[PDB]
Design an enzyme around this catalytic site. Structure first.
Site, PDB file in Angstrom:
ATOM      1  N   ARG A   1      10.927  24.224   8.826  1.00 21.44           N
ATOM      2  CA  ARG A   1       9.778  23.880   9.652  1.00 21.44           C
ATOM      3  C   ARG A   1       8.499  23.738   8.840  1.00 21.44           C
ATOM      4  O   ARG A   1       7.400  23.773   9.406  1.00 21.44           O
ATOM      5  CB  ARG A   1       9.587  24.925  10.753  1.00 21.44           C
ATOM      6  CG  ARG A   1      10.750  25.026  11.735  1.00 21.44           C
ATOM      7  CD  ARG A   1      10.452  26.047  12.814  1.00 21.44           C
ATOM      8  NE  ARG A   1      10.457  27.404  12.278  1.00 21.44           N
ATOM      9  CZ  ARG A   1      11.194  28.400  12.756  1.00 21.44           C
ATOM     10  NH1 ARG A   1      11.982  28.205  13.805  1.00 21.44           N
ATOM     11  NH2 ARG A   1      11.131  29.601  12.195  1.00 21.44           N
TER      12      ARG A   1
ATOM     13  N   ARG B   1      -7.034  12.074  11.470  1.00 26.07           N
ATOM     14  CA  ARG B   1      -8.319  12.633  11.870  1.00 26.07           C
ATOM     15  C   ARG B   1      -9.256  11.564  12.412  1.00 26.07           C
ATOM     16  O   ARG B   1     -10.092  11.855  13.273  1.00 26.07           O
ATOM     17  CB  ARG B   1      -8.972  13.339  10.689  1.00 26.07           C
ATOM     18  CG  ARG B   1      -9.130  12.436   9.486  1.00 26.07           C
ATOM     19  CD  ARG B   1     -10.322  12.824   8.642  1.00 26.07           C
ATOM     20  NE  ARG B   1     -10.670  11.750   7.722  1.00 26.07           N
ATOM     21  CZ  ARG B   1     -11.623  10.857   7.956  1.00 26.07           C
ATOM     22  NH1 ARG B   1     -12.329  10.925   9.076  1.00 26.07           N
ATOM     23  NH2 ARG B   1     -11.874   9.903   7.068  1.00 26.07           N
TER      24      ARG B   1
ATOM     25  N   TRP C   1      -8.541  -2.073   0.287  1.00 26.29           N
ATOM     26  CA  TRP C   1      -9.318  -1.005  -0.327  1.00 26.29           C
ATOM     27  C   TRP C   1     -10.362  -1.516  -1.312  1.00 26.29           C
ATOM     28  O   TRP C   1     -11.022  -0.706  -1.970  1.00 26.29           O
ATOM     29  CB  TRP C   1      -8.387  -0.005  -1.016  1.00 26.29           C
ATOM     30  CG  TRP C   1      -7.615   0.820  -0.041  1.00 26.29           C
ATOM     31  CD1 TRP C   1      -6.272   0.773   0.196  1.00 26.29           C
ATOM     32  CD2 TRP C   1      -8.146   1.813   0.847  1.00 26.29           C
ATOM     33  NE1 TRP C   1      -5.932   1.680   1.174  1.00 26.29           N
ATOM     34  CE2 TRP C   1      -7.065   2.331   1.589  1.00 26.29           C
ATOM     35  CE3 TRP C   1      -9.431   2.317   1.082  1.00 26.29           C
ATOM     36  CZ2 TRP C   1      -7.229   3.326   2.549  1.00 26.29           C
ATOM     37  CZ3 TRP C   1      -9.590   3.302   2.036  1.00 26.29           C
ATOM     38  CH2 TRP C   1      -8.497   3.798   2.758  1.00 26.29           C
TER      39      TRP C   1
ATOM     40  N   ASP D   1      -9.300   4.072  13.471  1.00 26.80           N
ATOM     41  CA  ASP D   1      -9.819   2.751  13.809  1.00 26.80           C
ATOM     42  C   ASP D   1      -8.753   2.046  14.632  1.00 26.80           C
ATOM     43  O   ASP D   1      -7.797   1.491  14.089  1.00 26.80           O
ATOM     44  CB  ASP D   1     -10.156   1.974  12.541  1.00 26.80           C
ATOM     45  CG  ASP D   1     -10.915   0.687  12.820  1.00 26.80           C
ATOM     46  OD1 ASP D   1     -10.846   0.172  13.958  1.00 26.80           O
ATOM     47  OD2 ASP D   1     -11.580   0.183  11.887  1.00 26.80           O
TER      48      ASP D   1
ATOM     49  N   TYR E   1      -5.043   9.275  -1.238  1.00 31.23           N
ATOM     50  CA  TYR E   1      -3.703   9.496  -0.697  1.00 31.23           C
ATOM     51  C   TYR E   1      -2.639   9.656  -1.780  1.00 31.23           C
ATOM     52  O   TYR E   1      -1.874  10.622  -1.766  1.00 31.23           O
ATOM     53  CB  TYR E   1      -3.338   8.347   0.241  1.00 31.23           C
ATOM     54  CG  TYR E   1      -4.355   8.121   1.340  1.00 31.23           C
ATOM     55  CD1 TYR E   1      -4.263   8.799   2.548  1.00 31.23           C
ATOM     56  CD2 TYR E   1      -5.411   7.235   1.168  1.00 31.23           C
ATOM     57  CE1 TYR E   1      -5.188   8.595   3.557  1.00 31.23           C
ATOM     58  CE2 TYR E   1      -6.342   7.025   2.169  1.00 31.23           C
ATOM     59  CZ  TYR E   1      -6.227   7.705   3.363  1.00 31.23           C
ATOM     60  OH  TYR E   1      -7.155   7.494   4.361  1.00 31.23           O
TER      61      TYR E   1
ATOM     62  N   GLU F   1       0.822  -1.203   0.000  1.00 31.89           N
ATOM     63  CA  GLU F   1       0.000   0.000   0.000  1.00 31.89           C
ATOM     64  C   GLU F   1       0.859   1.257   0.000  1.00 31.89           C
ATOM     65  O   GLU F   1       0.494   2.260  -0.619  1.00 31.89           O
ATOM     66  CB  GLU F   1      -0.942  -0.011   1.200  1.00 31.89           C
ATOM     67  CG  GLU F   1      -2.006   1.075   1.155  1.00 31.89           C
ATOM     68  CD  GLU F   1      -2.489   1.478   2.536  1.00 31.89           C
ATOM     69  OE1 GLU F   1      -1.652   1.563   3.459  1.00 31.89           O
ATOM     70  OE2 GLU F   1      -3.707   1.704   2.698  1.00 31.89           O
TER      71      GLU F   1
ATOM     72  N   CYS G   1      -7.751   9.478   6.138  1.00 34.96           N
ATOM     73  CA  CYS G   1      -7.734   9.345   7.590  1.00 34.96           C
ATOM     74  C   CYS G   1      -6.420   9.831   8.181  1.00 34.96           C
ATOM     75  O   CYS G   1      -6.423  10.558   9.180  1.00 34.96           O
ATOM     76  CB  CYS G   1      -7.988   7.893   7.987  1.00 34.96           C
ATOM     77  SG  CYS G   1      -9.639   7.320   7.556  1.00 34.96           S
ATOM     78  N   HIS G   2      -5.296   9.452   7.576  1.00 37.70           N
ATOM     79  CA  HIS G   2      -4.006  10.064   7.886  1.00 37.70           C
ATOM     80  C   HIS G   2      -3.839  11.227   6.917  1.00 37.70           C
ATOM     81  O   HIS G   2      -3.302  11.086   5.819  1.00 37.70           O
ATOM     82  CB  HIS G   2      -2.874   9.045   7.798  1.00 37.70           C
ATOM     83  CG  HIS G   2      -2.965   8.118   6.625  1.00 37.70           C
ATOM     84  ND1 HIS G   2      -3.716   6.963   6.650  1.00 37.70           N
ATOM     85  CD2 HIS G   2      -2.377   8.159   5.407  1.00 37.70           C
ATOM     86  CE1 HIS G   2      -3.601   6.339   5.490  1.00 37.70           C
ATOM     87  NE2 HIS G   2      -2.791   7.042   4.719  1.00 37.70           N
TER      88      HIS G   2
END
Ligand SMILES: Nc1nc2[nH]cc(Cc3ccc(C(=O)Nc4ccccc4CC(=O)O)cc3)c2c(=O)[nH]1
Ligand SMILES: Nc1nc2[nH]cc(Cc3ccc(C(=O)Nc4ccccc4CC(=O)O)cc3)c2c(=O)[nH]1
Ligand SMILES: O=c1ccn([C@H]2C[C@H](O)[C@@H](COP(=O)(O)O)O2)c(=O)[nH]1
Ligand SMILES: O=c1ccn([C@H]2C[C@H](O)[C@@H](COP(=O)(O)O)O2)c(=O)[nH]1
Lengths: 284, 284
Positions: free
Chosen positions: A147, A187, A81, A190, A107, A59, A167-168
């Site tokens: 930064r 965010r 997926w 699971d 992603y 993945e 989600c990430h």
């Protein structure tokens, strides 16, 4: 250390609040957590439960290729997926005329072509969009004290076109004393199914980028927003909660690689992985 | 409670690493921190040091308007963005033909018009871009269990056009038991100058959204990536570190407001704010 994840599980089981979610299931939810995992001479692949390492590697390579086609990952043996790209799910989101397996701008598309106009999964987006991954690699190479070494997958314009929003969603890199660290903002976590997978995925990404930039892997800081345990995961996790953790394995890259796109699955070797047997936790 | 910020200060002073930065100064840096500040019957305006509250309120109102003109904020008495919008600085970033005070596509432009083509600060961007703020407010109103209530200001496409890339780049909202909580990911934290300002800024945003959606303010989770203390801030902070913290004040909204754009500065009243005197900490 794995005791951080086990402590997060225990804390959600003891202090989480019952909360409905998008799926039919329910969750024990907690908002705002942070754990720290060392990447020095060890890899945070959980030992209290076997983690789909092949899925992690395939993945991540699928993310680096910028692919959003679930069939291309399923042909490798990784069906994580296939459910979110199935015909029934896309129909449940209104995408009736959308090809099966097309997850939308997710992603990989945001990592390599942020801002490009998404057509479908078969389109070639070469030269289009903002290439965040190569930008962070070059920034680490030329200005490690910067930064702003951030790769972000949250695109509000492409959000309603995604089968499952990221989600990430955001990650930042940090360099000090020739040590490369990575923080991830997740965010939605699971805790039973996806979170150990994302831990190993971003630790692997940190190892890859440290190999390319000539740095040593440092720490992985896992920040969680909505960290939730699904109901059908309560009794399984308790089982995992009564297992003695074993030492973390090690990750070895077998050949010197210059570009991140040149990494292949055979270049990585897990050494000393002695986990407890798997624990089935159905997806929602 | 305020002891969390002071504990982060102490932890950076005792465990931070010396690190160069974009400016000529140096920093004591730590990567990855997280604090929790309660918003229940109190407002986290620091008492160990007076915080420019007028600047906080006017800058949040300036963000909600979608404005990227620093002069519109300076005319109110808040000159915090005049340095990054000066002629010499805009020239130091190559923006030779850019009017003075034009910060480029920054926090307000991303909050209200994500994805819109940025022209200048004088342009009217009504209807353009993605209105993230109103989208999260509508999501809180109609689907509070949603795990995607996110407002993100990190736009890689508009990144080279910004005078200063966003430091508080992403925030997420969370609703449970009629309590609205907010987490902020700050990629770069000026612990002496900017962090006390951003804490109150996002607490005020949470109060506004809770007032509009009929919820009660819960917690504000401040997550930090590169949390650094500038060198010329070391001795000042030590002073603040030996002051007895006083109870947090209260924030009162004087009238019922329906839309977030209808808020005015006269609608807010701070009660019981008794801070210690200010401590000069120059900007870098
Ligand atoms: N609700 C919801 N939807 C999701 N959509 C996408 C994800 C991410 C994700 C991450 C990892 C795995 C995974 O390891 N699968 C797997 C494969 C083979 C054997 C054992 C297992 C784990 C197990 O079933 O025990 C599956 C999905 C995800 C999620 O975690 N939750
Ligand atoms: N290094 C670096 N650059 C920045 N660019 C933008 C920020 C955010 C920020 C947030 C708050 C304030 C603030 O209260 N200021 C203040 C208070 C009293 C008197 C004068 C001033 C202005 C000044 O002293 O210049 C200023 C800046 C920022 C930062 O924090 N650090
Ligand atoms: O890498 C991933 C992908 C998915 N999920 C889980 C989190 C949620 O349980 C679900 C997404 O649902 P929403 O929160 O967007 O409703 O997938 C993860 O934890 N990690
Ligand atoms: O709301 C803000 C804006 C700016 N900064 C600080 C963080 C950095 O010290 C500096 C910006 O420099 P970079 O981190 O982008 O190099 O401003 C904050 O802390 N909060």
């Amino acid at each position: 250390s794995e005791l951080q994840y086990l402590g997060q599980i225990q804390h959600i089981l003891r202090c989480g609040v019952r909360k409905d979610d998008r799926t039919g299931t329910g969750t024990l939810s907690v908002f705002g957590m942070q754990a720290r995992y060392s990447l020095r001479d060890e890899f945070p692949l959980l030992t209290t439960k076997r983690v789909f390492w092949k899925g992690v590697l395939e993945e991540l390579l699928w993310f680096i290729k910028g692919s959003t086609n679930a069939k291309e990952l399923s042909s490798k043996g990784v069906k994580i997926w296939d459910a979110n790209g199935s015909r029934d799910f896309l129909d449940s989101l209104g995408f009736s005329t959308r090809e099966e397996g097309d997850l939308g701008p997710v992603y990989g598309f945001q990592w390599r072509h942020f801002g490009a106009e998404y057509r479908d999964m078969e389109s070639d987006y070469s030269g289009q969009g903002v290439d965040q991954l190569q930008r962070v690699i070059d920034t680490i190479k030329t200005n490690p004290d910067d930064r702003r070494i951030i790769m972000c997958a949250w695109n509000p314009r492409d959000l309603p076109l995604m089968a499952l929003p990221p989600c990430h969603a955001l990650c930042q890199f940090y360099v000090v004393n020739s040590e490369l660290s990575c923080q991830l903002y997740q965010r939605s976590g699971d805790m039973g199914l996806g979170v150990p997978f994302n831990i190993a995925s971003y630790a692997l990404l940190t190892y890859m980028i440290a190999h390319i930039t000539g740095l040593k892997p440092g720490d992985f800081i896992h920040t969680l927003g909505d960290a939730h345990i699904y109901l059908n995961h309560i009794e399984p996790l308790k089982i995992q909660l009564q297992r003695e953790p074993r030492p973390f394995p090690k990750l070895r890259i077998l050949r010197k690689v210059e570009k991140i796109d040149d990494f292949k699955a055979e270049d990585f070797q897990i050494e000393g992985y002695n986990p407890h047997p798997t624990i089935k936790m159905e997806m929602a």
